[PDB]
Design a protein around this motif. Sequence first.
Motif, PDB file in Angstrom:
ATOM      1  N   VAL C  64       0.816  -1.312   0.103  1.00  0.00           N
ATOM      2  CA  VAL C  64      -0.096  -0.202  -0.001  1.00  0.00           C
ATOM      3  C   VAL C  64       0.853   1.159   0.036  1.00  0.00           C
ATOM      4  CG1 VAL C  64      -1.824   1.216   1.381  1.00  0.00           C
ATOM      5  CG2 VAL C  64      -2.023  -1.171   1.109  1.00  0.00           C
ATOM      6  N   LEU C  65       2.010   1.275   0.796  1.00  0.00           N
ATOM      7  CA  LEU C  65       2.838   2.480   0.906  1.00  0.00           C
ATOM      8  C   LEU C  65       3.897   2.575  -0.223  1.00  0.00           C
ATOM      9  CD1 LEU C  65       3.436   2.478   4.781  1.00  0.00           C
ATOM     10  CD2 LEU C  65       1.981   3.921   3.404  1.00  0.00           C
ATOM     11  N   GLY C  66       4.235   1.417  -0.787  1.00  0.00           N
ATOM     12  CA  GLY C  66       5.419   1.548  -1.862  1.00  0.00           C
ATOM     13  C   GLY C  66       5.100   1.516  -3.418  1.00  0.00           C
TER      14      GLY C  66
ATOM     15  N   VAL D   1     -13.687  11.669  -8.520  1.00  0.00           N
ATOM     16  CA  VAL D   1     -14.358  11.034  -7.451  1.00  0.00           C
ATOM     17  C   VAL D   1     -13.729  11.430  -6.120  1.00  0.00           C
ATOM     18  CG1 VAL D   1     -15.094   8.757  -6.428  1.00  0.00           C
ATOM     19  CG2 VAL D   1     -15.014   9.112  -8.858  1.00  0.00           C
ATOM     20  N   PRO D   2     -14.458  11.689  -5.069  1.00  0.00           N
ATOM     21  CA  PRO D   2     -14.028  12.037  -3.774  1.00  0.00           C
ATOM     22  C   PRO D   2     -13.029  10.921  -3.162  1.00  0.00           C
ATOM     23  CG  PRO D   2     -16.305  12.669  -3.932  1.00  0.00           C
ATOM     24  CD  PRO D   2     -16.037  11.927  -5.371  1.00  0.00           C
ATOM     25  N   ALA D   3     -12.111  11.214  -2.708  1.00  0.00           N
ATOM     26  CA  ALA D   3     -11.145  10.257  -2.089  1.00  0.00           C
ATOM     27  C   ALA D   3     -11.819   9.118  -0.977  1.00  0.00           C
ATOM     28  CB  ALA D   3     -10.162  10.673  -1.611  1.00  0.00           C
ATOM     29  N   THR D   4     -12.779   9.586  -0.295  1.00  0.00           N
ATOM     30  CA  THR D   4     -13.265   8.798   0.598  1.00  0.00           C
ATOM     31  C   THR D   4     -14.159   7.928  -0.081  1.00  0.00           C
ATOM     32  OG1 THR D   4     -13.407  10.444   2.557  1.00  0.00           O
ATOM     33  CG2 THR D   4     -14.830   8.536   2.733  1.00  0.00           C
ATOM     34  N   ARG D   5     -14.773   8.144  -0.966  1.00  0.00           N
ATOM     35  CA  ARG D   5     -15.609   7.342  -1.766  1.00  0.00           C
ATOM     36  C   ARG D   5     -14.876   6.064  -2.785  1.00  0.00           C
ATOM     37  NH1 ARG D   5     -18.920   8.036  -7.594  1.00  0.00           N
ATOM     38  NH2 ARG D   5     -20.099   6.347  -7.663  1.00  0.00           N
ATOM     39  N   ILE D   6     -13.702   6.558  -2.952  1.00  0.00           N
ATOM     40  CA  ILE D   6     -12.657   5.460  -3.742  1.00  0.00           C
ATOM     41  C   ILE D   6     -12.316   4.514  -2.425  1.00  0.00           C
ATOM     42  CG2 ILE D   6     -10.281   5.190  -4.371  1.00  0.00           C
ATOM     43  CD1 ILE D   6     -12.512   6.434  -6.559  1.00  0.00           C
ATOM     44  N   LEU D   7     -12.095   5.166  -1.469  1.00  0.00           N
ATOM     45  CA  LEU D   7     -11.959   4.273  -0.237  1.00  0.00           C
ATOM     46  C   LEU D   7     -12.804   3.193   0.162  1.00  0.00           C
ATOM     47  CD1 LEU D   7     -10.057   3.310   2.204  1.00  0.00           C
ATOM     48  CD2 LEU D   7     -11.166   5.207   3.529  1.00  0.00           C
ATOM     49  N   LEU D   8     -14.071   3.548  -0.198  1.00  0.00           N
ATOM     50  CA  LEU D   8     -15.029   2.655  -0.012  1.00  0.00           C
ATOM     51  C   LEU D   8     -14.967   1.511  -0.942  1.00  0.00           C
ATOM     52  CD1 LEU D   8     -18.326   4.633   1.401  1.00  0.00           C
ATOM     53  CD2 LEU D   8     -16.443   3.630   2.721  1.00  0.00           C
ATOM     54  N   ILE D  67      -8.233  -4.449 -10.055  1.00  0.00           N
ATOM     55  CA  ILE D  67      -6.775  -3.798 -10.291  1.00  0.00           C
ATOM     56  C   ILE D  67      -7.060  -2.380 -10.455  1.00  0.00           C
ATOM     57  CG2 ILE D  67      -5.190  -3.614 -11.958  1.00  0.00           C
ATOM     58  CD1 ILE D  67      -5.381  -6.903 -12.180  1.00  0.00           C
ATOM     59  N   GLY D  68      -8.103  -1.824 -11.194  1.00  0.00           N
ATOM     60  CA  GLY D  68      -8.367  -0.564 -11.514  1.00  0.00           C
ATOM     61  C   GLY D  68      -8.664   0.154 -10.408  1.00  0.00           C
ATOM     62  N   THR D  69      -9.634  -0.250  -9.587  1.00  0.00           N
ATOM     63  CA  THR D  69      -9.852   0.276  -8.240  1.00  0.00           C
ATOM     64  C   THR D  69      -8.732   0.531  -7.203  1.00  0.00           C
ATOM     65  OG1 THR D  69     -12.111  -0.784  -8.577  1.00  0.00           O
ATOM     66  CG2 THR D  69     -11.597   0.417  -6.289  1.00  0.00           C
ATOM     67  N   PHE D  70      -7.989  -0.534  -7.344  1.00  0.00           N
ATOM     68  CA  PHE D  70      -6.877  -0.169  -6.496  1.00  0.00           C
ATOM     69  C   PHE D  70      -5.801   0.771  -6.907  1.00  0.00           C
ATOM     70  CE2 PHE D  70      -2.602  -1.620  -4.416  1.00  0.00           C
ATOM     71  CZ  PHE D  70      -2.844  -1.821  -3.049  1.00  0.00           C
ATOM     72  N   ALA D  71      -5.614   0.672  -8.087  1.00  0.00           N
ATOM     73  CA  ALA D  71      -4.581   1.826  -8.728  1.00  0.00           C
ATOM     74  C   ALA D  71      -5.232   3.007  -8.389  1.00  0.00           C
ATOM     75  CB  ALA D  71      -4.510   1.632 -10.037  1.00  0.00           C
ATOM     76  N   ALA D  73      -7.073   3.975  -6.056  1.00  0.00           N
ATOM     77  CA  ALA D  73      -6.911   4.072  -4.475  1.00  0.00           C
ATOM     78  C   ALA D  73      -5.678   4.487  -4.004  1.00  0.00           C
ATOM     79  CB  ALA D  73      -7.490   2.944  -3.694  1.00  0.00           C
ATOM     80  N   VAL D  74      -4.463   3.922  -4.589  1.00  0.00           N
ATOM     81  CA  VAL D  74      -3.087   4.081  -4.262  1.00  0.00           C
ATOM     82  C   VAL D  74      -2.593   5.688  -4.709  1.00  0.00           C
ATOM     83  CG1 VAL D  74      -0.797   3.719  -5.096  1.00  0.00           C
ATOM     84  CG2 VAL D  74      -2.530   1.888  -4.352  1.00  0.00           C
ATOM     85  N   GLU D  75      -3.184   5.979  -5.996  1.00  0.00           N
ATOM     86  CA  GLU D  75      -2.893   7.223  -6.479  1.00  0.00           C
ATOM     87  C   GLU D  75      -3.444   8.471  -5.386  1.00  0.00           C
ATOM     88  OE1 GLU D  75      -3.546   9.089 -10.738  1.00  0.00           O
ATOM     89  OE2 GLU D  75      -4.990   9.545  -9.638  1.00  0.00           O
ATOM     90  N   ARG D  76      -4.648   8.080  -4.801  1.00  0.00           N
ATOM     91  CA  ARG D  76      -5.222   9.043  -4.082  1.00  0.00           C
ATOM     92  C   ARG D  76      -4.608   8.993  -2.699  1.00  0.00           C
ATOM     93  NH1 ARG D  76      -7.420  12.592  -3.782  1.00  0.00           N
ATOM     94  NH2 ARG D  76      -9.775  13.175  -4.124  1.00  0.00           N
TER      95      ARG D  76
END
Lengths: 82, 82, 82, 82
Positions: C64-66, D1-8, D67-71, D73-76
């Motif tokens: 997550v961090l890297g 998209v708001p970052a908190t929505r991406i988190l959810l 994979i897209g959702t995680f990508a 999320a990491v960027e946010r």
Amino acid sequence: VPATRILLLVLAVIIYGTAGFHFIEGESWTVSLYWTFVTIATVGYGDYSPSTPLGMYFTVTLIVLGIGTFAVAVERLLEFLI
Amino acid sequence: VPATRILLLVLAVIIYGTAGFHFIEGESWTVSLYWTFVTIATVGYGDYSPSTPLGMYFTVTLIVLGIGTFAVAVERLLEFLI
Amino acid sequence: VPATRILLLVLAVIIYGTAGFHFIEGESWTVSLYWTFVTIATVGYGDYSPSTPLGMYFTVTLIVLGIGTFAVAVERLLEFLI
Amino acid sequence: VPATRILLLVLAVIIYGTAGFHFIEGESWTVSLYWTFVTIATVGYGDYSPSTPLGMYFTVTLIVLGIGTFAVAVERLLEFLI
Ligand SMILES: [K+]
Ligand SMILES: [K+]
Ligand SMILES: [K+]
Ligand SMILES: [K+]
Ligand SMILES: [K+]
């Protein structure tokens, strides 16, 4: 590019990868489809991988033609669900 | 960057990775070329990987120099086929 | 972000990943540094991976961090060599 | 998209992947959560992977949806720490 065109392009990649692994490396259709997704997504578990020179060459062609297509397809799918 | 320059840069990466794996880890030229693509694409099956400290250092250098170059090359290839 | 700041951030990630794998999973410093790069680049050969619950949790934190930090660092390195 | 929505959205993906691997492939909750992160980040060590046709189908669905959702999320997450 229209999203539906991208869909057709990634489906063409999936057909190419699946039929190629099946006929060159001899794995079942189902395993070959799974391996194709695992490869073009760059997950690459390694539970399946080519064991022959022809399979290695083929896998390089799928990597070059498929990773970019899959990446664009995922990004477009993101737009339609988010 | 012009697309043809990017092509030359990724070819240089492929030569570097292939010759290095071949001479350091002792795998065949063909296996080493396959491993180079699998590595810089970040697929990473693990059917081949460095077993020596020098090979591990070399592989880190290929990861740092090669993944970005390959990613740009794939994106440019996308433009010319789509 | 200035490129030198990104460099410091990815170096901090590399130190974190290397010391953590070494102390939690018990691999050598060299193997742990190699594994850290293989992980945050998303290559993931699997020749090394955590075998303990604490190691699995730690590896998730490094992912997550890297991965994002490494991706930005590679992109900046691209600017300075191309 | 708001970052908190991406988190959810990425948390929903993680729940889906973890429960699915646990019930289909029979691995522990902890191993299944670890495998889910390793998969949607595209690290793909291969220390764990689906052995059944249903598991292979499920894993493809997680790859496509995750994979897209995680990508994103990491960027946010990058924005909030850098
Ligand atoms: K990857
Ligand atoms: K991988
Ligand atoms: K992998
Ligand atoms: K990107
Ligand atoms: K692997």
